């Protein structure tokens, strides 16, 4: 019936200083602080009886205005032992569909179309197939050159997939986006599997349509269930990260589910959301401290 309140910066703006953390504490009776990261991350152990609602709104008024993120969670079983992560716009800073698109000429009438299948206004699969439709031609050789080109890893990525297995968790990267970038990203990044979409060609160039059936949200939901019970635990034993509408089932169904930057449609359905930090506050979510990181 413990719990703790963790107060998350981004490295690269890390405004947590010392005095905050303390002022934090202060504001919700703390019975101490303990100091994850410097200017960066602080656990505060709530008093026994204190809501869960009352902390967060007392912490959130402490730091208005400052780019620090809070969480509240049970201290016991905050360290999980399954990751899965969406990867367009959570594990990589682009959009894979967006940036095939460009190869096409059309990555701001695709862009737009993405942008509201994430903000849940249009259903992923019709969504995705008739973005998927405008890249009909493309060849084969645009793949590679979109990911050595254009695509680039959120920060944080690589430490919080390695740190976590380090410590024995089973990581997967699941995406409704395109299995010839989830296969190679997973592996820069270090995630054990990788479960994507495909785009189907003719041997050459891109045919415009997408394997079927298409993975959508309940392909991410039923892939932490098939997760979880092949490694023999429960999808309360997973922390589940995205930024889009299709990932909201598998955020509310794992035991710890994270909105990272995502729009606040998104971020009004998750019960824990991250905006300022960067990956790494998934490990500071999960009680580790930077003595614990894989440098
Ligand atoms: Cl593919
Ligand atoms: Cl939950
Ligand atoms: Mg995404």
Same mark, same amino acid.
């Given at each position: 019936?413990?719990?703790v309140a963790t107060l998350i910066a +981004?490295?690269?703006?890390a405004a947590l200083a010392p005095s905050l953390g303390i002022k934090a504490s202060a504001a919700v009776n703390a019975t101490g602080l303990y100091w994850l990261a410097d200017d960066i991350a602080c656990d505060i152990p709530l008093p =026994?009886?204190m809501?869960?609602?009352?902390a967060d709104?007392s912490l959130r008024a402490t730091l208005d205005g400052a780019?620090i993120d809070v969480?509240?969670?049970?201290?016991?079983?905050?360290?999980?032992?399954? @990751?899965?992560?969406?990867?367009?716009?959570?594990?990589? %800073?682009? /959009?894979?569909?967006?940036? @095939?698109?460009?190869?096409?000429?059309?990555?701001?009438?695709?862009?737009?179309?993405?942008?509201?299948?994430?903000?849940?206004?249009?259903?992923?699969?019709?969504?995705?197939?008739?973005?998927?439709?405008?890249?009909?031609? =493309?060849?084969?050789?645009?793949?590679?050159?979109?990911?050595?080109?254009?695509?680039?890893?959120?920060?944080? &990525?690589?430490?919080?997939?390695?740190?976590?297995? #380090?410590? %024995?968790?089973?990581?997967? =990267?699941?995406?409704? &986006?395109?299995?010839?970038?989830?296969?190679?990203?997973? !592996?820069?990044?270090?995630?054990? /599997?990788?479960?994507?979409?495909? @785009?189907?060609?003719?041997?050459?160039?891109?045919?415009?349509?997408?394997? /079927?059936?298409?993975?959508?949200? !309940? *392909?991410?939901?039923? #892939? =932490?269930? !098939?997760?979880?019970?092949?490694?023999?635990?429960?999808?309360?034993?997973?922390?589940?990260?995205?930024?889009?509408? +299709?990932?909201?089932?598998?955020?509310?169904?794992? &035991?710890?589910?994270?909105?990272?930057?995502? #729009?606040? *449609?998104?971020?009004?359905? *998750? #019960?824990?959301?991250?905006?300022?930090?960067?990956?790494?506050? @998934?490990?500071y979510?999960? &009680?580790?401290?930077?003595?614990?990181?894989?440098?």
């Amino acid at each position: 019936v413990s719990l703790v309140a963790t107060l998350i910066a +981004n490295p690269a703006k890390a405004a947590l200083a010392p005095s905050l953390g303390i002022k934090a504490s202060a504001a919700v009776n703390a019975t101490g602080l303990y100091w994850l990261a410097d200017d960066i991350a602080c656990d505060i152990p709530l008093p =026994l009886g204190m809501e869960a609602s009352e902390a967060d709104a007392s912490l959130r008024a402490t730091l208005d205005g400052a780019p620090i993120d809070v969480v509240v969670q049970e201290q016991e079983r905050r360290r999980k032992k399954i @990751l899965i992560a969406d990867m367009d716009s959570t594990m990589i %800073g682009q /959009e894979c569909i967006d940036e @095939l698109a460009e190869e096409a000429g059309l990555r701001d009438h695709v862009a737009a179309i993405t942008a509201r299948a994430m903000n849940g206004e249009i259903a992923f699969e019709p969504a995705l197939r008739e973005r998927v439709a405008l890249l009909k031609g =493309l060849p084969l050789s645009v793949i590679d050159k979109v990911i050595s080109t254009r695509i680039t890893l959120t920060p944080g &990525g690589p430490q919080l997939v390695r740190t976590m297995r #380090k410590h %024995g968790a089973y990581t997967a =990267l699941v995406s409704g &986006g395109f299995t010839s970038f989830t296969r190679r990203i997973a !592996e820069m990044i270090g995630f054990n /599997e990788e479960r994507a979409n495909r @785009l189907i060609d003719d041997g050459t160039r891109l045919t415009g349509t997408v394997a /079927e059936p298409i993975l959508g949200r !309940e *392909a991410k939901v039923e #892939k =932490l269930v !098939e997760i979880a019970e092949r490694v023999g635990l429960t999808p309360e034993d997973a922390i589940a990260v995205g930024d889009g509408a +299709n990932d909201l089932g598998m955020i509310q169904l794992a &035991g710890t589910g994270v909105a990272l930057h995502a #729009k606040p *449609a998104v971020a009004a359905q *998750a #019960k824990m959301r991250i905006d300022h930090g960067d990956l790494t506050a @998934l490990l500071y979510i999960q &009680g580790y401290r930077k003595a614990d990181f894989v440098q």
